[PDB]
Ligand binder design. Sequence first.
Ligand SMILES: *C(=O)c1ccc2c(n1)c(C(=O)Nc1cc(NCCOC)c(C#N)cn1)cn2CCC
Length: 300
Amino acid sequence: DLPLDPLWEFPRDRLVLGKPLGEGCFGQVVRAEAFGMDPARPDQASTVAVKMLKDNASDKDLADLVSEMEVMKLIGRHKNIINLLGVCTQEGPLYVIVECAAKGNLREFLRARRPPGPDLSPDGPRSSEGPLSFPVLVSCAYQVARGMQYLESRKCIHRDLAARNVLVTEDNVMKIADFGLARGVHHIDYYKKTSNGRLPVKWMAPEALFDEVYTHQSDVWSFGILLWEIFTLGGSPYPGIPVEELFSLLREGHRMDRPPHCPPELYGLMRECWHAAPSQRPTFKQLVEALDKVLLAVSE
Ligand SMILES: *C(=O)c1ccc2c(n1)c(C(=O)Nc1cc(NCCOC)c(C#N)cn1)cn2CCC
């Protein structure tokens, strides 16, 4: 039914759908095996993620997914985003084929890799040493900023940027996901709590929350929250603060405290991303350069 785009069109029979990876407001994501995604090797197997409508698919749900697909085609390719690989639009359900991140989202990645606690018995030379180190945490922050810098250059606003919308690959490469979606910004339930207990409003910039205004600088605010998430190793922002309290606190200029085991450099960056005036927040280009200096300094 949709027009044929031979640039991106991929034979659906070359896909073998596997285990589902999650759901969203519109559409779901399924792990899949692809054969000949590289046209030079028609029988080569590769692991991809497939986006597709649910069974309750409205015309709006289809429109949103179709819209996302077209955004995917225009943004282009970058190392730190979820890239479009192909689409299935002919003779069958709509498939949007993208890259697959084997290690899940950034939030769960960090939470599963929190350091050993005080109960754990000393067994071996490294039982006090956890999977995560400071330079790697900075590297994660750096890669997200580079990805956002790319998206910004392509005039793309994320509008949700969070650790849950950042995906981790086999080689611990950060990849920004779901950046080109229609997120229904004129009708957000600010009290909405997701199934994993997330309050998405805790990532909204003031001008986005109060004035419904979204810019790249509003994404910078969200990046600041994302920084806090990283150095809390998957912690939820504004700890133990209900949405009603968040409203008045934000109006009073309240900001999150400096998390434990976090150098003043990065909390400084967090506070810069949380400046009231969007023009006094660092650009993503400035964030990349700033995070690079810190990363180089710890990369002996
Ligand atoms: C693919 O190799 C793969 C294998 C195991 C995976 C896995 N992916 C994922 C996963 O989350 N994959 C994934 C998910 C999404 N979207 C979910 C929404 O995130 C914002 C996308 C996209 N777009 C790409 N890849 C999890 N697991 C197993 C958990 C360890």
